[PDB]
Amino acid sequence: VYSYTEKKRIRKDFGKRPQVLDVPYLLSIQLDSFQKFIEQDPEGQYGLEAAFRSVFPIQSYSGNSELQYVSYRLGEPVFDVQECQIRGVTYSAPLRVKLRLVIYEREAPEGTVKDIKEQEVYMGEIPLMTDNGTFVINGTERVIVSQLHRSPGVFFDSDKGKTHSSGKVLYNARIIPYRGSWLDFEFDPKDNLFVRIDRRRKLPATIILRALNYTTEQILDLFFEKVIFEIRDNKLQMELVPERLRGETASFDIEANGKVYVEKGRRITARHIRQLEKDDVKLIEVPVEYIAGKVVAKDYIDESTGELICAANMELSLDLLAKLSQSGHKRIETLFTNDLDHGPYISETLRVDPTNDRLSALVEIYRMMRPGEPPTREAAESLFENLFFSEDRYDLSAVGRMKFNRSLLREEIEGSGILSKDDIIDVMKKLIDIRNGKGEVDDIDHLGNRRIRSVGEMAENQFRVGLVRVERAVKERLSLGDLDTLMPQDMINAKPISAAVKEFFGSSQLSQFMDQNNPLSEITHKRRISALGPGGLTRERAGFEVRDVHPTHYGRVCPIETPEGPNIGLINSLSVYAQTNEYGFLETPYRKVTDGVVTDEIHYLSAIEEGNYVIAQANSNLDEEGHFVEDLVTCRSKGESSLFSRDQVDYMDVSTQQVVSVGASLIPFLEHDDANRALMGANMQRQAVPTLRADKPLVGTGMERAVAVDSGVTAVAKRGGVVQYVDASRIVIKVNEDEMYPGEAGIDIYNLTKYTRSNQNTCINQMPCVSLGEPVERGDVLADGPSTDLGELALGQNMRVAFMPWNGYNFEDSILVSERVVQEDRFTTIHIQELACVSRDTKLGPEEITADIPNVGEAALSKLDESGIVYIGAEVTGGDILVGKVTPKDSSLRVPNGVSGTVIDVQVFTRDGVEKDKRALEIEEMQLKQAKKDLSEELQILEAGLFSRIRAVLVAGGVEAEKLDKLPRDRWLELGLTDEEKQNQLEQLAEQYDELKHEFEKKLEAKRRKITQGDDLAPGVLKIVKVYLAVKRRIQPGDKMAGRHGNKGVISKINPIEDMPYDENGTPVDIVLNPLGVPSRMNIGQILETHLGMAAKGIGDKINAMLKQQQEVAKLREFIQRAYDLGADVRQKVDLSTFSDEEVMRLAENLRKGMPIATPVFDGAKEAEIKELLKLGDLPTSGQIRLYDGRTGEQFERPVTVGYMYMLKLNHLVDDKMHARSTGSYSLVTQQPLGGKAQFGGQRFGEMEVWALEAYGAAYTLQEMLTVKSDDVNGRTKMYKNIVDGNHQMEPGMPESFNVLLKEIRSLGINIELED
C-alpha cells in the first residue's frame, strides 16, 4: 500500500475524517486557459479560431471582392527557454495564417469568381507559456493573474435612499454588454422613467421606445390593462374586473343585481369581492364622477368631420363625455391606475416626452450622442442601428445571453448576441414590476455575478482589438479600385497586431513580475485573483462594501489570505478545491447525499445553485454507512446557518480544508489562532528565503508534498524505473519494461539546473535525492529544488525555543538567538547578483574595455587579466574593478560598496561588425567544447540503452549469451532470428538507432550555429559584459525572522552559548522569545505547536539513543509501531510487519532527528493525544520543564516552556536597508539631494517633521536643515569649507527651489517679485 520511495520517511498522521477527494493539480486555471487559447478548435468557439471567424470575412463596399480566412498555424519557436532567458528576448512563436483573396466579376450578377488567389501571410508574435505557467518576455519571466470583473447581463440595482433627502428609494436597471455601449434606466424622484446611454445626458424613455417605431397607443396597450366604459341609455354601465376591488375603497354605492354590494366611504373587503364573484357580477352602474380623474387609452376621432375628438393619453372632462356621446362612441378604453398596484409610471414619461414620431426621436438621440453636427435623415437612423443592433459593434457574449435569460425567467440558455424590441420591453416591464413590489433588487458582491477572466480570454480579446485595425485598413483599401494586382501581404500589416499583443503582455496592470523566492510564492502567485485592472475598480477609490467577505465566498475564495495595507480584499486568493465553471463562475465540490446515505459521488456547484439546497458542513460525525450519528445536523441553507433534521439535507462538504487557500493551509493548528494574526502568518510565510540546506518541518499539515511536486522546482519522474547513474548534475533512469513503448526504447534522462539567479537574487539549484539501484515509480520525486527535502516543502529551520523574558533583550518583539544557530551555519543564505557594463558609442569616438586605465596602481588591477575582464573565481570585495572601461578623451564598473563574494560566471555579447577580443573568443571556444562533449555523452547513453534493449529481445528465442559478447556491439543488429514479430522489433530498433545518429549529428550543427552567431543588441551599444557575484549573507543583529503564526521579530543579539539557559540535562536552548506577546495577540497556535514539536523531538531522541548503542531490529520495530499507534481512531494505520527488515533500519535512520507529525488544519490533534504522545517519551506531561540560568548558575523558579518551533528568515535583511549619505550627487531642475539607495541619495525631511521641529522652540536647526544642508548652493559650498577648516557657521542665503517656483509662476501671466 506504501510506495518504496514513500517509506523513506512516513509522516505520522493525526486526523479522523477520511479524505474522499484528493487535491487537484494546483495550476489548472493557467495551463488550461492558455491551453484553450491556442488550439485547433473546429467547433470554432475557443481561442484564436473564434476571433478570426468573428472578424473575417471582409466584404468591400462595392463590393466587387472580399478577403476571407481559411486556417492558421504556429511555427517552431526560434529560441528555447534557456537561451531566451540568457539573452533577453521573448520566448515567442511566429503566427502564420492562410488568408485568401477572392475577386468577383463586376458585370456578372452578384456572386461569381474571376480568379481567386491566396498565400500564407505572416502576422504577429504571440508569446508562449512555459511548462510551469509563466511567460518569458525579456529574460524576466512574468505571470498573468486572473481578473474578477462583474459579468455581462442585466442588474436591477438600487440606491439605499442616499439622494433627495426624502427617504424615497430609486430603483435603476442596467444592461451591461460584453463589448459595446451600456444602457441604463432610472427613476426620477417624480416617478418618471429616464434612459441613459454610456453615462451621457438624461432622456425620457418614451423616446427610445419610439425609436423602435412604436406609437402611443401601442405603448399603452403594451404597459397597461384597459377599463371599458359603455355609453348607454343610463350613464355608463361599466364592465368591471373583479380583481380591481382588492386593496381599494368605494367612492360610491356599488349596487348591482338589485343588491347593495357596498356603499361609499367603505374600504372593500375580500368578503365584498367574494360576494361579488358569488353573484358573478360583470357590469356595474358607475356614477359619472368616477371618470373625473381618468385618462383615455387610444385616440378617438369624430366619424363625420374626420377630426380628432381626443388624442390618446389625456385626461377626461365632462364636456369631453358630452362630445363622446354626441359622436356615439359606445366603447371607451381608459387606463387601469392605482397607487400601489399599477402606478401610471409610463403616462407621466409620455407627458414629459417632447417628441411624437420616429424621425424626431432619432434626431433627438443623434443630437444627444453627438453635440452639434446638424443631423440628417439617414445619420440618426444609421447611428441607432449600428449602435445597438449590429453584431460588429455590440455583442452580448454567450455568458451574457445565458445570464440575461436567467434573469428574466426565460427557458432558452442560448440566443442572439444582440438586443431586440422584446428585450428592452421586458427589462422595462421588470423594472416597473420591481417598483410595484414584486421582485427584489440584486446585490453586487454575490459570487454568482462576478466572473473569473483568466489569461487566455484577456489575451484573445487584445488580439481581436488588434485585428479590428487591420480589418479597417483592408476594408478601406479594397474600397478603392485597382484590385487586379493586389496580394494579401501589403494590405495586411504585422506591426499593429504585434504592438497590440506585446504591449499587453509586457506592460499591463495584470502581467506582473513573478516573485520567485520560494516554491510557495510561485504557486500562490499564479492562483491570485485580482479585481483591479482594465474594466475593474480602482484601488484608492473603492468603497468598503467591496472589501468585505460575502457569505458566498465559502469554499471559493479564501477569506483569511489577503495582502493587508492599501488594498485589502481586492487581491484575494483562490481556495484549494475551487474549479472554474464552463462560463467562468467559480465552482466548488460537494458530496451528493441521497435519501439518507452520504455517498462518494461528487457534484461541482456554482454560486447560485448553492442558494437553493441545504448543505451540512464538513465535520458532521457519521459511522461507516453515511448515517449521521447525530440528528440535529448543522447546515448552511442559504446565506445563513442553522440546525436541520437528519433527512432534510442534500449535500455535505468534501473536506475540512476546502475553505482556506493553499498558502494558509500549511499553518498547523490554524483553528486556534485569531484571524488577522493568521493573515499575517500567511503573508510572511510567502517571503521565506531558501536556506543553505533545507530541513523538514517537524509539524506540518500534510499539504506539503502537493505544493512541492505541483510547483515546477522538483524534478518529478515521468516513467518509473531503475536509476542507472546519478550525478551532481544529471540523472538517468532505465524505464521499466511495462511503461516502455514498442519502438524508441531509449532511457529517460534528466538535466538539473545548477546555481542560477531567481528574480529576487536568491540562488536556486537542484540536488539528487536518490542513489544507484533505487527503484522509482511514476510521479515520484527525484531532484529537490530550493527549500525542499525528499519532496516536501521546507522553507525554514526548526529550532529549540524557550518562552521567558531575558534581561530585556527581547523587550517588545525582539528575539535572542544563541550562537549555535550561527556556528552550525544553518541560516546563511546564498544570494546572486548580476552586474552589467556596456560600451556605449558616444561622441569623441567610442570607448572600449581595455585592461589599462589611468592613475591607478597595479594592486587594484591584479585581479584583471590582460584583456580587462576578471577571472572566473576571483574573490572580489567592496570597491574593486570587475571590468576596466575608459573615458574617451575612467568609467570602469566597480563592485557596490559593502558587498563581498566570488565571481561565478561571465558573459559577453558583441554587436555584428565588431571584432571579438581575446576573452570573448576564449568563452566561445569553451562553450563549443562543452556543447560537443555534452551531446556526445548523451548520445552514447541512449545508444547503450538501445543495445541493452536489443540484447534483451535477442535472448528471447535464440539466446547465445556467449556469442553476444564475442562479436562487439557494433555488429549485433543483423544477427539471425526466427520469423515472427521479433524480427519486426529488431528492424524497428535498428531504424531507431540510425535515426538517433542523424538527429545528433544535426543537432550539434544547430547548437554551433546558435553559439557562434552574432548577437542582436539595442542601438548605440557595442558590447555588453555581465558578471555574476555570489554572496553568503550569514546573519546579523537586525535581520527579521518570523514564525508561521505571525509572531515576527527582529533578532537582537548573538549570545555566546555559555550564557544561554540550559536544562538539567545540559542542552542549552537556541532562541528566547518573549511570552508577553501571546495573550494580547491571541494566537495560541504557536504554544500548542511548541508542545507538539517537543513531543516529536522527544521520540526522535529516544530512537537516536536506541540506535547509538547497537539495538537489533527487534526493538526498533516494536517501538516505531507503538509510536505510529496511539491516536483517537486515526486514519493512518501504518503496519510495520510488512517492511523488508532493512527499510525498517533506514526508516529509523531518517527518524533519528524527530518523527514528523501531520495535523490537517481544521481536524487537528486535540490536547489529549498530545499529552499521550508526550508521555510516550519520558518528557514531563505538563509541557514545562525547569531551566537554569547561564551566568549565575542558579535555578529559575516558575518552570518555563521549552519546545521546538519552525522559523523562517524573511527576505528583509539589514544590509539591504542600512544607508548613509554625507555629500553626494544633486538633482538637476531643483538643487536637492537625490533620493533612494540606488543613487547615493539622502533622506527626506518631510512636512510633518518640519511641523515637529517648529513645535519645539528649535528654529536655527530647521532653518539650516532646509537652507544650507540641501538647497542653497553657495551656502553649502561655504559650509563645507568652514567645516573642513574647523569653524562651524553658515551663510544662509535663499533656497534655489524658491527661485524655481518664482520663475514657474511668472511663466504664466502673473508678475510676482520681491519688494524692497
Partner: protein
C-alpha cells in the same frame, strides 16, 4: 506643476530631502542610559566625514583633502580613534516615519556599536510608538554650533518627560519591566523564611541572593524614610515596617524624599506611573530620570529571574461552562417552540434569544474569572487558605503588562456574539474559546469580523492624516507674543455632569490655568486666592478642601493681544512645570496634540436620585397639582442634587409638565424616585381650576366629532 502633492509647494518647498542623513533598522539594547543611543560604525564614519577630515588636517596626518579622503576610504586604524574623538559630545536626531506629535523626533548622544542596527533605549519606544518588529528610523546630524546647543537644550531625551497633550508622564515603564516589578512586590501566604526580622533593605537583598528566603514573604524590616515637609530640609525618621523582602529590596532604589507607602502595594502599571509622577513633582528632574533608569534595570533583572512563561495548562476552562451553555440552549429552544406555534412574534423571539445568550455569556465570563483569579488555595502552616492566584496569564493581565480582561474572556470563556457585515447580530453565538478549537463556520464569522477591523483601521488613519494637516494649517500663525494682556473676562470652569456621576472633577480642568477674578471661599467675603495667580497643585488642594464649585478662569479665546496671545491668558506650559515662555509656538503643538489620537477613535422614564442630599431647582415656574406634588410650567427647569457640603454633586434635566414629589430645598433619600412625566404625548396643561369652554370649536368644518368608540366618553379632535 504647482497644485497637488506633486507640485512644488508640498513637494520641494515645504519639505526637502537633506544631506547628512541615514536610515536603518532598530533593536533594543537595554544597557543604555536614557540619554544615548547606539550607532553603527559604518553609518558613523559616513555621516561625520567632514569632521574627520577637519581633525586629520588639524593633526597634520594628511596635508590635503585628497590624501585625507584616501585615508578615510581605506580607514587606516588611526581614523577610528579620531572618530571616537569627534563623537564625544555631538548629539544626533532620531526620527520615525509617521511622526505625529512633537515627541516623534528626539535628540540623543551616539555610542558607537560594532553592528549594523541603530540601538534604541527601550523606554522611549512608548514615545515613538515604535515596536521592534522591523521599524526603520532615520538619523540626522546638526552641523552648526547653534544647532548643537538647540539639540542639547531642547530635544535631548532627558528634557521631554511630560507629554504636551497633558501633564501625564510619557516614559512610563511599558510592558516587561512592569511585569517584573509586579511579580516582585507580592506575597505568598507561606513562603520560605516567613516571619524573621531584618536590619534594613540591603540585609534583605543579601538574604534573598544567598537563597535562604524566597523573593516574597512577609517580614518585619526597619526602614529610614526621609521627609522634606520642612522648608526644603530632609528629615530622617526610622521605623519598623512589616513588608515583604521584594518590596524591601525595591526600596533600595528610590531617591531620598518619598514616603515608604509608595512601594508597599502590588505595584501594577498605574502605580508605577503615579510613583514616577510624584517623584518628578517632589524632586525636580534629574532624580526622576536617574530613578527611571534604575527602575528599568531592576525590573528587567527580576523579570528575567522570574521565568514567567506561558503554557497551555495556564488557560483554565471553568468546569461549569458546558452546563451553562446547555441550559442556555434549552432556554433558546423553548422560545423557538413558542414562536413555532405563533404565540410570539419574530422580533420578540429574536430579541429574547439575543438577551438570553448575552446572559449566558456573562455568566460564563464571571465563572471563568472567579475560578482563575483565586484558584490558589495553600495551607498557611496550619490547615488551608486562599490568596491571589499566580496563574501566569492572570499575572500578566492584572499587572497591566498586556491584554485586558476581554482577551482573557476570549481565550478561556466563550467568545461572545459575532456580528454579520450589515450591522446585524447573529442569533447563534460562538460557543468555543481558543484553548479548544473553532470549527469551520465559527472561524468564517470571526474572519469577517477581523477583515472589517483591518479595513477600518486603514481608512481611518488615511482620513486622520488629512484632519491633522487641515488643523495645523489654521493655527500655525499663532505665537504667544506678550507678557500680560491685562483683561478680566474669562470663563466659568466647573466639573462636568452628564446626568450621572462626575465624568471630570474640577481639580483636573483648572490645574494650571491662571485665575480671572479672585475666588471667594464659601465663607463669602473670604478671599481665598488672588485674582491673577497660577492654580498649581497646592492651590488645587486648597480649592479641594474648601469644596470650591465654579471658578472664573482666563482663557485664550478672549485675550486682547493682537497677532498673538498673552502669556498669562494661556496658562502653564504643560510640558514643563512653569508658566509659558514668551515667544513660543502654541498653535502647532495644539494642532498636533489634537490630531495625534485621531487614529485611536472609531469610525462608524423617571428620575432616580442616587445620593442623599438637598435638591435645588433652577428656573422653576410651577404650581401645586391635585395630589400636592409640584407640576412645572417651564422648559429650562433643571434639578441639582447638592451634598451636605453645599457643593453640587448631581444634575438632571426636567421635562416640561413633569410632576415632582418634592418642592425646593428638601432632602432626598438615596434611590428615591423624585419625579415622573409622560415623555410620549404632550398635554394641554392649564394653570388654575375652573370651567373649560370650547371657544371657536365647531364640528363640521373646524374639527371632527371623533367620539371615542371603545368607551364612549366625549371626544372631539381639532
Amino acid at each position: 506643476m504647482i497644485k497637488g502633492k506633486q507640485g512644488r509647494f508640498r513637494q520641494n518647498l515645504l519639505g526637502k530631502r537633506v544631506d547628512y542623513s541615514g536610515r536603518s533598522v532598530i533593536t533594543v539594547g537595554p544597557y543604555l542610559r536614557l540619554h544615548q543611543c547606539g550607532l553603527p560604525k559604518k553609518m558613523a564614519l559616513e555621516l561625520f566625514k567632514p569632521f574627520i577630515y577637519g581633525k586629520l588636517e588639524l593633526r597634520g596626518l594628511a596635508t590635503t583633502i585628497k590624501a585625507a579622503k584616501k585615508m578615510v576610504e581605506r580607514e587606516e586604524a588611526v581614523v577610528w580613534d579620531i572618530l571616537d574623538e569627534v563623537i564625544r559630545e555631538h548629539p544626533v536626531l532620531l526620527n520615525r516615519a509617521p511622526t505625529l506629535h512633537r515627541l516623534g523626533i528626539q535628540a540623543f548622544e551616539p555610542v558607537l556599536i560594532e553592528g549594523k542596527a541603530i540601538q534604541l533605549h527601550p523606554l522611549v519606544c512608548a514615545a515613538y510608538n515604535a515596536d521592534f518588529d522591523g521599524d526603520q528610523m532615520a538619523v540626522h546630524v546638526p552641523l552648526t554650533l547653534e544647532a548643537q546647543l538647540e539639540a542639547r537644550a531642547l530635544m535631548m531625551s532627558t528634557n521631554n518627560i511630560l507629554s504636551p497633550a497633558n501633564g501625564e508622564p510619557i516614559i512610563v515603564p511599558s510592558q516587561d519591566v512592569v511585569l517584573g516589578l509586579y511579580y516582585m512586590t507580592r506575597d505568598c501566604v507561606n513562603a520560605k523564611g516567613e516571619g524573621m526580622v531584618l536590619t534594613g533593605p540591603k540585609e534583605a537583598e543579601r538574604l534573598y541572593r544567598s537563597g535562604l528566603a524566597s523573593l516574597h514573604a512577609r517580614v518585619k524590616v526597619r526602614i529610614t524614610e526621609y521627609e522634606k515637609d520642612a522648608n526644603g530640609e530632609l528629615v530622617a525618621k526610622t521605623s519598623l515596617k512589616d513588608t515583604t523582602v521584594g518590596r524591601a529590596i525595591l526600596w533600595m532604589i528610590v531617591p531620598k524624599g518619598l514616603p515608604y507607602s509608595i512601594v508597599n502595594q502590588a505595584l501594577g502599571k498605574k502605580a508605577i506611573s503615579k510613583m514616577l509622577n510624584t517623584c518628578y513633582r517632589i524632586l525636580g528632574l534629574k532624580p526622576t530620570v536617574i530613578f527611571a533608569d534604575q527602575i528599568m534595570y531592576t525590573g528587567f533583572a527580576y523579570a528575567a529571574r522570574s521565568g514567567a512563561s506561558v503554557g497551555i495548562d495556564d488557560m483554565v476552562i471553568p468546569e461549569k461552562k458546558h452546563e451553562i451553555i446547555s441550559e442556555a440552549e434549552a432556554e433558546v429552544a423553548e422560545i423557538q417552540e413558542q414562536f413555532q406555534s405563533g404565540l410570539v412574534t419574530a422580533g420578540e423571539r429574536y430579541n429574547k434569544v439575543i438577551d438570553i445568550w448575552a446572559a449566558a455569556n456573562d455568566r460564563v465570563s464571571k465563572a471563568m474569572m472567579d475560578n482563575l483569579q483565586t484558584e490558589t488555595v495553600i495551607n498557611r502552616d496550619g490547615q488551608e487558605e486562599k490568596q491571589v492566584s499566580f496563574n501566569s496569564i492572570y499575572m500578566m493581565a492584572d499587572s497591566g503588562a498586556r491584554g485586558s480582561a476581554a482577551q482573557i474572556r476570549q481565550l478561556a470563556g466563550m467568545r461572545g456574539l459575532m456580528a454579520k457585515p450589515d450591522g446585524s447580530i447573529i442569533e447563534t453565538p460562538i460557543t468555543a474559546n481558543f484553548r479548544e478549537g473553532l470549527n469551520v463556520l465559527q472561524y468564517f464569522i470571526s474572519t469577517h469580523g477581523a477583515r472589517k477591523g483591518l479595513a477600518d483601521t486603514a481608512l481611518k488613519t488615511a482620513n486622520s492624516g488629512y484632519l491633522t494637516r487641515r488643523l495645523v494649517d489654521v493655527a500655525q500663525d499663532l505665537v504667544v507674543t506678550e507678557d500680560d494682556c491685562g483683561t478680566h473676562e474669562g470663563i466659568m470652569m466647573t466639573p462636568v455632569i452628564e446626568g450621572g456621576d462626575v465624568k471630570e472633577p474640577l481639580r483636573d480642568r483648572v490645574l494650571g490655568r491662571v485665575t480671572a477674578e479672585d475666588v471667594l471661599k464659601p465663607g463669602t467675603a473670604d478671599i481665598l486666592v488672588p485674582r491673577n495667580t497660577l492654580l498649581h497643585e497646592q492651590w488645587c488642594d486648597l480649592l479641594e478642601e474648601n469644596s470650591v464649585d465654579a471658578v472664573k478662569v482666563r482663557s485664550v479665546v478672549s485675550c486682547d493681544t493682537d497677532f498673538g496671545v498673552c502669556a498669562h491668558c494661556y496658562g502653564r506650559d504643560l510640558a514643563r512645570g512653569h508658566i509659558i515662555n514668551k515667544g513660543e509656538a502654541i498653535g502647532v503643538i495644539a494642532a498636533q496634540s489634537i490630531g495625534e489620537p485621531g487614529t485611536q477613535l472609531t469610525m462608524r422614564s423617571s428620575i432616580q436620585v442616587k445620593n442623599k442630599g438637598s435638591i435645588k431647582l433652577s428656573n422653576v415656574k410651577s404650581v401645586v397639582n391635585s395630589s400636592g406634588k409640584l407640576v412645572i410650567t417651564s422648559r429650562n427647569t433643571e434639578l441639582k442634587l447638592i451634598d451636605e457640603f453645599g457643593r453640587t454633586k448631581e444634575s438632571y434635566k426636567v421635562p416640561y409638565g413633569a410632576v415632582l414629589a418634592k418642592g425646593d430645598g428638601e432632602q432626598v433619600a438615596g434611590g428615591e424616585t423624585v419625579a415622573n412625566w409622560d415623555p410620549h404625548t404632550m398635554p394641554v396643561i392649564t394653570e388654575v381650576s375652573g370651567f373649560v369652554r370650547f371657544t371657536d370649536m365647531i364640528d363640521g368644518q373646524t374639527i371632527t366629532r371623533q367620539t371615542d368608540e371603545l368607551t364612549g366618553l366625549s371626544s372631539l379632535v381639532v
